[PDB]
Design a protein around this ligand. Structure first.
Ligand SMILES: NC(=O)C1=CN([C@@H]2O[C@H](COP(=O)(O)OP(=O)(O)OC[C@H]3O[C@@H](n4cnc5c(N)ncnc54)[C@H](OP(=O)(O)O)[C@@H]3O)[C@@H](O)[C@H]2O)C=CC1
Ligand SMILES: NC(=O)C1=CN([C@@H]2O[C@H](COP(=O)(O)OP(=O)(O)OC[C@H]3O[C@@H](n4cnc5c(N)ncnc54)[C@H](OP(=O)(O)O)[C@@H]3O)[C@@H](O)[C@H]2O)C=CC1
Ligand SMILES: *CCS(=O)(=O)NC1CCN(c2ccc([C@H](C)Nc3ncc(F)c(N4C(=O)OC[C@@H]4C(C)C)n3)cc2)CC1
Ligand SMILES: *CCS(=O)(=O)NC1CCN(c2ccc([C@H](C)Nc3ncc(F)c(N4C(=O)OC[C@@H]4C(C)C)n3)cc2)CC1
Lengths: 399, 400
């Protein structure tokens, strides 16, 4: 009489402040009632990180590498103010940084689209997934600036002229990129495309940077033809290179539903549009097995201060919920678990349908009709909305 | 009696824009304004016939007379050489003119209240100014890549480590920027701000590129404080530096009506939104006298192929029209010609009012209600729309 799904091995990381409260509600109301998990829980709360000297963060990373699926709640990155607040032993490095450094791979951002919530481009009815991949100095006066390559094998040194400053000074800088980095970026991008069953596009400026950006185009094409092209044709999808100039135009005339590898912020645009609560951030390792899913937003400290004073809050849980669904969706693919695959999709649909039915948090109401025009009847508080998702999920899974 | 416009350099172009350019002169300009007109045909056939000498003459003419208005021109590729049997693959006329005149290119969208915007909050235009290469190469295998500065005065040579390749190969490149280039970019940006009476913003990444982007921030601030700050305070406007991260957020929460100097594309976004016909591109020289105005779009080849087959076309002339109005507006400022200044503004108002009244080309109708939902009664063809502007301009100028 359990009735629940066998989810398998999932690494879970608890976080800080407002997201921590929402994270517990998601597990209690949306996940645990329907899914049984071999759950590897790690508390990346600031207090426990301080208590363990950030050893919990390193253990969490090694656990993700072993079990292949990670879902992470937003965490506090210590600054000077945070050290004084919690009396921290040290100004600990960003947990995200530590995890990224150990796992590696490419970060991919995906917005959640609802038909009753406006978009930057109204034509975009399906999400677009964006994947992102120096020594500068002042030239005091006239002189020759050159960039030189000295081979490790002790063969002849090669020299290239950057610019000869004949009158006056200016600035100069050198950039670089290793082949291994570009290969990893390509693999991750192809893995993501097959995982989602959408076509992939790489954008560069290879007309201008014929060698530098040319290397990106070449390495992508080589790896595609030799390893991935057959698997893409099997799912009726494709990979193509585009010039950034053409890609922007094509992307905006498109209706979305494709992967975009970008050689070059996505967050700033989301902040400007006020849609941080509706964007997820998945780290995809190039091995094709390991994945770490989380919200693109932080711990929402401002909202937490109101919660601490016992005031009503309306914090958007969709980004946090979709971190779970993307993680479980990947678990389902690795294990060929069609029951879990269905649940992951079902929860995503319930979430969108609930907002499309008119039930949403304050940020979404403000997005529709502007923040000044929002009244209390236009939206639900953090707990009311989670309850409404809970009721709608029970009905969908019963059907 | 018509208006005495003065000295204006005019450059005829190619394909669809060439047809619209002639209609603008015939219907909107010549009936009301007399010009000491310096006409140069930068049509691909005449450029080929003169071995691109007409393009160089056009540039020298703009430098002499200070005001240029240019129709969109074909930039030869391999396909164009075969089409016109060209003697050589001639360089972009825009490139030749920019190389001779110099200065910074500024793009400005035309805003109508009944035409949607990327950001609905934007009710006034935003003017984007870009700065304008690099030495890139392949790193075949492991080794040390360094960038070195050897002073011409024979003082100590300085060496910086770019990257030590330990495990494999990759790519590396060197970029530069001269002080004079940054100074010209600053001057042009301050001139544009005062000309429009709007505040200016420079965006950089000086948190990461502390030296390279730092130089931009410093040179802008120096030139502002010493030459421009007093003149800005006189018009109740200001200049401030911003981090690109903050500037994007601020810009999108803003209602527009400011100059944006960008050190990190505008055309691609316009193409994607289908509003290329509503964006102008003015080259502002740092001397404050010389200006070259044109549409941000090309010759609209796709539309021209339909015209050649005798099919109906709906090509937006607003960008091309505003090239003329911005040119004549600058002429009017240089010559203290209030009669021409009024006409330039009057034509701009007529253009916006006509679209706001419901009379527009197919691109604008498609922008409102989506291309699939557009019917023939929703828009006017290229010639119908030009006729409607002509009638509305006559009425507006009669009232005054
Ligand atoms: N991945 C991670 O763990 C990240 C870590 N952080 C950490 O987060 C903490 C706080 O950073 P802060 O910039 O304030 O956090 P956010 O990135 O959450 O931004 C704060 C503001 O964004 C809006 N917002 C963000 N998410 C939501 C949501 N789900 N629902 C509604 N509104 C939302 C709110 O605007 P409004 O006030 O108008 O409602 C809120 O005040 C810091 O300690 C920082 O280090 C930050 C970024 C990412
Ligand atoms: N300054 C200059 O002189 C420039 C020169 N060119 C030249 O232009 C030629 C063609 O360039 P191309 O790539 O087609 O770019 P264009 O900008 O000329 O046209 C591209 C597309 O943009 C839309 N568009 C552009 N202008 C208008 C308008 N006034 N009204 C309505 N829609 C418009 C149309 O989309 P849709 O097809 O959907 O209607 C059009 O097919 C080339 O020979 C190129 O060298 C290009 C750019 C700059
Ligand atoms: C890589 C080239 S870049 O550096 O110039 N990035 C810019 C171009 C693309 N862009 C952008 C596109 C898509 C997203 C997010 C991840 N996906 C998304 N899909 C559909 C969708 F409708 C939306 N949004 C939307 O329409 O408005 C809200 C939301 C986005 C814009 C916050 N997003 C992010 C960034 C802009 C940067
Ligand atoms: C310099 C930094 S960048 O390289 O990232 N440029 C991007 C950020 C700004 N941006 C942009 C802004 C403004 C314009 C045009 C020149 N001006 C403009 N003002 C008001 C306005 F409403 C519009 N448009 C609009 O809302 O939708 C149509 C039209 C634009 C978006 C085609 N434009 C161009 C580009 C994006 C690139």
């Amino acid at each position: 009489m359990s009735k629940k799904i066998s989810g398998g091995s999932v690494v879970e990381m608890q976080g800080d402040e407002m997201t921590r409260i929402i994270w517990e509600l998601i597990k209690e109301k949306l996940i645990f009632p329907y899914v049984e998990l071999d759950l590897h829980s790690y508390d990346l709360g600031i207090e426990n990180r301080d208590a363990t000297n950030d050893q919990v963060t390193k253990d969490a990373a090694e656990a993700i590498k072993k079990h292949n699926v990670g879902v992470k709640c937003a965490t506090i990155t210590p600054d000077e103010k945070r050290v004084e607040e919690f009396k921290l032993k040290q100004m600990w490095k960003s947990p995200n940084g530590t995890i990224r450094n150990i796992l590696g791979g490419t970060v991919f951002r995906e917005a959640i689209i609802c038909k009753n919530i406006p978009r930057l481009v109204s034509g975009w009815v399906k999400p677009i997934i964006i994947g992102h991949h120096a020594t500068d100095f002042v030239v005091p006066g006239p002189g020759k600036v050159e960039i030189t390559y000295t081979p490790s094998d002790g063969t002849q040194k090669v020299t290239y002229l950057v610019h000869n400053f004949e009158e006056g000074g200016g600035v100069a800088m050198g950039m670089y990129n290793q082949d291994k980095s570009i290969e990893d970026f390509a693999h991750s991008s192809f893995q993501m495309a097959l995982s989602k069953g959408w076509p992939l596009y790489l954008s560069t400026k290879n007309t201008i940077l014929k060698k530098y950006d040319g290397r990106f185009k070449d390495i992508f094409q080589e790896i595609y033809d030799k390893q991935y092209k057959s698997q893409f044709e099997a799912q009726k999808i494709w990979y193509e290179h585009r010039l950034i100039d053409d890609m922007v135009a094509q992307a905006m005339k498109s209706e979305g539903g494709f992967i975009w590898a970008c050689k070059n912020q996505s967050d700033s645009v989301a902040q400007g549009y006020g849609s941080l609560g509706m964007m997820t951030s998945v780290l995809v390792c190039p091995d094709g097995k390991t994945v770490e899913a989380e919200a693109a937003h932080g711990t929402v400290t401002r909202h937490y201060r109101m919660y601490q004073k016992g005031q009503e809050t309306s914090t958007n849980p969709i980004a946090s919920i979709f971190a779970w669904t993307r993680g479980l969706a990947h678990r389902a693919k690795l294990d060929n678990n069609k029951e879990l695959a269905f649940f992951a999709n079902a929860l995503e649909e319930v979430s969108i349908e609930t907002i499309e039915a008119g039930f949403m948090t304050k940020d979404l109401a403000a997005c529709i009709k502007g923040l000044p025009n929002v009244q209390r009847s236009d939206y639900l508080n953090t707990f009311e909305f989670m309850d409404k998702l809970g009721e709608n999920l029970k009905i969908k899974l019963a059907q």
